[PDB]
């Protein structure tokens, strides 16, 4: 150890956070607050399409993101703890711990 964890940005009642895609996903680990609204960008800056879709499954969410494009990825987090994202293929995997 220590694992590294990113916080969000906390701003007018939004937790926002940029996820790079490329070789893995950097910060592949991050944190966010509970009840508080987050937007998490993603930006695909490879073309392999090992990375063409966003995958966040307790929260239902699958996106497809495009070569060079930024999607924004919503949602509240309501429950603590760590949850996995990954890419669509789940060969890419992180993290994000919601705390109270
Ligand atoms: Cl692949
Ligand atoms: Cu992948
Ligand atoms: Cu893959």
């Given at each position: 150890?220590?694992?590294?964890?990113?916080?969000?940005?906390?701003?007018?009642?939004?937790?926002?956070?940029?996820?790079?895609?490329?070789?893995?996903?950097?910060?592949?680990?991050?944190?966010?607050?509970?009840?508080?609204?987050?937007?998490?960008?993603?930006?695909?800056?490879?073309?392999?399409?090992?990375?063409?879709?966003?995958?966040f499954e307790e929260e239902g969410i699958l996106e497809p993101i495009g070569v060079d494009e930024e999607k924004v990825i919503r949602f509240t987090p309501?429950?603590?703890?760590?949850?996995?994202?990954?890419?669509?293929?789940?060969?890419?995997?992180?993290?994000?711990?919601?705390?109270?």
């Amino acid at each position: 150890g220590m694992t590294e964890i990113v916080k969000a940005s906390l701003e007018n009642g939004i937790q926002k956070i940029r996820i790079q895609a490329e070789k893995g996903y950097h910060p592949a680990h991050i944190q966010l607050q509970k009840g508080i609204p987050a937007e998490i960008t993603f930006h695909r800056a490879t073309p392999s399409n090992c990375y063409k879709e966003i995958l966040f499954e307790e929260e239902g969410i699958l996106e497809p993101i495009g070569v060079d494009e930024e999607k924004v990825i919503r949602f509240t987090p309501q429950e603590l703890g760590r949850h996995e994202f990954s890419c669509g293929m789940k060969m890419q995997k992180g993290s994000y711990t919601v705390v109270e």
